[PDB]
């Protein structure tokens, strides 16, 4: 369309681990008054949520110390929550929801949302035909977008939807897997 990021220019979010940073490090930085300080560059995952970071040290002088948990909130003013079930059955039709959130304080968004074609699924999307809706999301609200699909192959299969707003440089995509199980 006129004045909107093209589907192919959107890189979907995909890294949605429940835990990460399972790491071991010794505090051997040159100490001051008995204390060593370590700086770690971490790459935040793609989840929009709050991570709880827990540290435990072991010292031959001080024993064991479980630290107070440290929280980091990762967010965005516009995003998709692709709410997939844990698993689905081969050849059974399901409805999944893409929930679009607008957390801008006073700006409502005209949004184009699309379900991507995938030959592992039957849906209204084909190779030659897009399945795209234009919706308006008011300030500080959300819109639930339903999609009907049929899994056609078992194993770990993937569902992807993307959205962009007209007249702004805002877009999002979510690419997630679910387990497809035989009949």
């Amino acid at each position: 369309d006129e004045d909107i990021i093209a589907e192919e220019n959107i890189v979907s979010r995909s890294e949605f681990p429940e835990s990460w940073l399972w790491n071991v490090e010794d505090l051997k930085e040159p100490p001051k008054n008995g204390i060593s300080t370590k700086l770690m560059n971490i790459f935040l995952k793609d989840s929009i949520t709050t991570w709880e970071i827990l540290a435990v040290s072991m010292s031959d002088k001080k024993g064991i110390c479980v630290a107070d948990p440290f929280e980091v909130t990762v967010m965005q003013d516009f995003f998709i929550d692709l709410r997939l079930p844990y698993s689905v059955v081969r050849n059974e039709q399901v409805e999944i929801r893409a929930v679009l959130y607008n957390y801008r304080q006073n700006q409502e968004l005209k949004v184009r949302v699309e379900l991507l074609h995938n030959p592992a699924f039957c849906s209204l999307a084909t190779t030659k035909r897009r399945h795209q809706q234009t919706v308006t999301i008011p300030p500080k609200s959300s819109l639930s977008v339903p999609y009907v699909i049929v899994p056609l192959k078992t194993g770990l299969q993937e569902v992807e939807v993307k959205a962009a707003v007209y007249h702004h440089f805002i877009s999002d995509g979510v690419r997630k897997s679910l387990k497809v199980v035989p009949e």
């Binding site: 490090e25 991570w51 540290a55 435990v56 072991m58 001080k62 024993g63």
Partner: protein
């Protein structure tokens, strides 16, 4: 008559530094002491080093620290002072310490990996290198994986993982681990297996009080809070239903079910007293508890979260009184100090709760931060069991809503009816490291022998080892002397102090007089570990963004980490590792068993986790049991 005495812990451990306290009472000049350790019965001579010299300038008090290598097993400890042999048979523990087990998450799906760590520490909580056996058991208690690993060269950290099969029994799985040499002492974590997806918001259910008072016309009032894991408030609808638990079994109250709007992330719901009692003689309900179950659905139907607050006790009083911290022995004729512990019904300490002994009638003292108040009564010189009732004097309350509790103390029995006593006391405040604690020594004896007492020997027991021993000197005529005792992080989570004096009194009669006191210390890490942001600035991170984590900790410490989506904890927040859980395991492993004093001097030592043996034949009874009485 020089009397030589030896003091050690009741239970000795293997491959750890133990301390034997050595004293020559009424000695002159220097006195050589060789201390020996042997297997019982027979001879192997397991510890054979350890000599020292007792000295006028150290007032004939000293040491030797020793390490044992490496039914129930015993050793014979043997001290030879000059030529004088003093020996004691002592119980031996095969325990290496504790194991703490950490998983990355609380709950898992089939076909994922459980990442976990065992922390191998001794009884001081210091890293220990040992062989550890591991087992993962399914819900029905069948072991399905076992490792056998050493934590040698490993700084007390064993990193393991296990892959959940796709074909697996749902439910509570268990990790069980023990040191190779103590298969009797097994440590466990549970994790949940279940098919699920992460929810996008959390639901919190908070009753306005942590209990229900049966005569509260208002019923049980409850707030429901729903917010997205990233911060924002939920708009939605709540279904909340109440029920009654006793004590394993639950009865739903179907008439209590409500549907409410969650507006601005919030909604209000009540269980009226009338619906409560209809659904079931109101006093029949005290001692049972209430649960609240809430289902919240986003207004779109697109996500749903269930939560429950349970174990909300139905009460006549907002408070409970506990004597768990008060000695169950008194000195007839001397004041008796009670440490009164007051909790909220859920178990948390109550702050600023006034308490008093039956009647009173002036008196009264206020509970503190830790829930503890100190009272003291005066006592008759009779040998009859002392029976003390304490309440609870909350204004605003009313007599029927005040807590009450009764306990009994028995008399400390003296040597050949001498009527000589020692009484230790200590101001009740929260004790932190960096503070000094004044320990008060109050002497009761006849003026005809009092001048013979020139010192007290004190011993500090902590985490099952003799932390510290010393002397508190005394002048003739001094009823009260005070020891300024410096508290450090070595004293966490708590400790016992025992003191004693000795003399020849009645008819050449050798007398030992002992007292002891249990002191709580504020719990924290011995060291320090802070995790925080490193970017000196700014608003919330965006998906995929790089940030700097900063870790501040003790030089040389191994640090292990994990980051967990807080949506995991909406599903399950049980079994997480915590410094609190670590100190709880530590205090449960105390070899002292009692809040203090004892039935006689021997009981004082033994109850506090110490042996005492003198060359004149004064000694504690043998401890053969690896656990405390109950």
């Amino acid at each position: 008559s020089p009397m030589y005495s030896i003091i050690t812990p009741n239970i000795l451990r293997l491959e750890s530094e133990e301390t034997m306290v050595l004293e020559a009472h009424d000695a002159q000049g220097d006195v050589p002491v060789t201390v020996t350790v042997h297997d019982f019965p027979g001879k192997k001579l397991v510890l054979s080093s350890e000599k020292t010299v007792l000295t006028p300038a150290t007032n004939h008090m000293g040491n030797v620290t020793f390490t044992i290598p490496a039914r129930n097993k015993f050793v014979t400890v043997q001290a030879t002072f000059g030529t004088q042999v003093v020996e004691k048979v002592v119980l031996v523990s095969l325990q290496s310490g504790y194991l703490f087990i950490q998983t990355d998450k609380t709950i898992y799906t089939p076909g994922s990996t459980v990442l976990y760590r065992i922390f191998t520490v001794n009884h001081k909580l210091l890293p220990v290198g040992r062989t550890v056996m591991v087992n993962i058991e399914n819900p029905e208690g069948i072991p399905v994986k076992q490792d056998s690993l050493s934590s040698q060269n490993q700084l007390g950290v064993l990193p393991l993982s296990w892959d959940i099969p796709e074909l697996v029994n749902m439910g509570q799985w268990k990790i069980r681990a023990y040191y190779e040499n103590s298969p009797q002492q097994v440590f466990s974590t549970e994790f949940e297996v279940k098919e699920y997806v992460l929810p996008s918001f959390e639901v919190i259910v908070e009753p306005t009080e942590k209990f229900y008072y049966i005569y509260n016309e208002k019923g049980l009032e409850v707030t429901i809070t729903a917010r997205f894991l990233y911060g924002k408030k939920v708009e939605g609808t709540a279904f909340v239903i109440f029920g009654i638990q006793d004590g394993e079994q639950r009865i739903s109250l179907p008439e209590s079910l409500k549907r409410i709007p969650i507006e601005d992330g919030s909604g209000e719901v009540v269980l009226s007293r009338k619906v409560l009692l209809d659904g079931v003689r109101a006093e029949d309900l005290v001692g049972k508890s209430l649960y609240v179950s809430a289902t919240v659905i986003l207004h779109s139907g697109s996500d749903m979260v269930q939560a429950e607050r349970s174990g909300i006790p139905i009460v006549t009083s907002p408070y409970q009184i506990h004597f768990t911290k008060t000695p169950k022995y008194f000195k007839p004729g001397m004041p008796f100090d009670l440490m009164v512990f007051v909790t909220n019904p859920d178990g948390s300490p109550a702050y600023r709760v006034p308490v008093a002994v039956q009647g009173e009638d002036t008196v009264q003292s206020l509970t503190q931060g830790d829930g503890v108040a100190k009272l003291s009564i005066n006592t008759h010189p009779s040998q009859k069991p002392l029976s003390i009732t304490v309440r609870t004097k909350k204004q605003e309350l009313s007599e029927a809503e005040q807590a009450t509790r009764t306990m009994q103390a028995l008399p400390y029995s003296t040597v050949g009816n001498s009527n000589n006593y020692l009484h230790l006391s200590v101001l009740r405040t929260e004790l932190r490291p960096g503070e000094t604690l004044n320990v008060n020594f109050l002497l009761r004896m006849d003026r005809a022998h009092e001048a013979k007492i020139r010192y007290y020997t004190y011993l500090i027991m902590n985490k099952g080892r003799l932390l510290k021993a010393g002397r508190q000197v005394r002048e003739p005529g001094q009823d009260l002397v005070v020891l300024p005792l410096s508290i450090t992080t070595d004293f966490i989570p708590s400790f016992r102090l025992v003191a004693y004096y000795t003399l020849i009194g009645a008819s050449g009669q050798r007398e030992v007089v002992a007292d002891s006191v249990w002191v709580d210390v504020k719990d924290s890490c011995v060291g320090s570990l802070v995790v925080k942001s490193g970017q000196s600035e700014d608003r919330q991170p965006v998906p995929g963004q790089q940030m700097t984590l900063k870790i501040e900790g003790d030089h040389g410490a191994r640090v292990v980490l994990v980051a967990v989506d807080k949506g995991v904890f909406v599903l399950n927040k049980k079994n997480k590792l915590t410094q609190s859980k670590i100190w709880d395991v530590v205090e449960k492993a105390d070899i002292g068993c009692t809040p203090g004093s004892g039935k006689d001097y021997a009981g004082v030592f033994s109850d506090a986790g110490l042996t005492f043996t003198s060359s004149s034949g004064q000694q504690t009874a043998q401890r053969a049991e690896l656990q405390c009485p109950q």
